[PDB]
Design a protein around this ligand. Sequence first.
Ligand SMILES: Cc1cc(C(=O)NS(=O)(=O)c2ccc(N[C@H](CCN(C)C)CSc3ccccc3)c([N+](=O)[O-])c2)ccc1-c1cccc2c(CCCOc3cccc4ccccc34)c(C(=O)O)nn12
Length: 152
Amino acid sequence: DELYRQSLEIISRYLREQATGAKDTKPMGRSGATSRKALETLRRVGDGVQRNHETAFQGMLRKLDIKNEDDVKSLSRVMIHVFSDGVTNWGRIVTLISFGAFVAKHLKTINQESCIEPLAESITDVLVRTKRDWLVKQRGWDGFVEFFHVED
Ligand SMILES: Cc1cc(C(=O)NS(=O)(=O)c2ccc(N[C@H](CCN(C)C)CSc3ccccc3)c([N+](=O)[O-])c2)ccc1-c1cccc2c(CCCOc3cccc4ccccc34)c(C(=O)O)nn12
């Protein structure tokens, strides 16, 4: 189940880096080459999504009323209902993960830093349960990186 493992690594790191403002120094794993480039991709593409859907992200966050790990537990059920509706593409997977980072910054501001792990697990779980095969078809994270690769 390398896919759940790679995905969690990428998503947790992006969420953590986003909440704290600080890159993590610790080495990756099996395909940390891909993992790093996928993290670098999220930095550019994930950040843009946050800038452009700031209002909807704030509105979604406020309506969700997230205060603790408990409020986080219930998040995942709303997450899957919204996400598994409509069409699959890389853009919606990035919207998913980007709102995850938006929620993670909010958690940090409210002193719920440790809600960031289960949030990441919950995002990773939703994505992999509903999109595993599409992800496989796309060459998972290498495909992610290749599809979004632009000149710096
Ligand atoms: C992008 C987007 C666009 C719209 C939208 O509807 N935008 S809108 O129509 O342009 C518009 C509408 C209204 C207003 N304003 C209202 C005023 C209304 N009055 C007329 C009454 C108030 S403000 C307000 C109030 C409410 C909403 C918007 C704004 C305005 N506005 O004012 O600008 C513009 C709505 C939502 C999203 C959105 C948010 C977050 C995640 C997500 C996903 C990923 C899956 C879910 O992930 C998770 C789900 C749940 C939890 C998770 C946790 C972690 C990770 C992922 C999680 C997808 C997706 O995959 O599709 N979409 N999202």
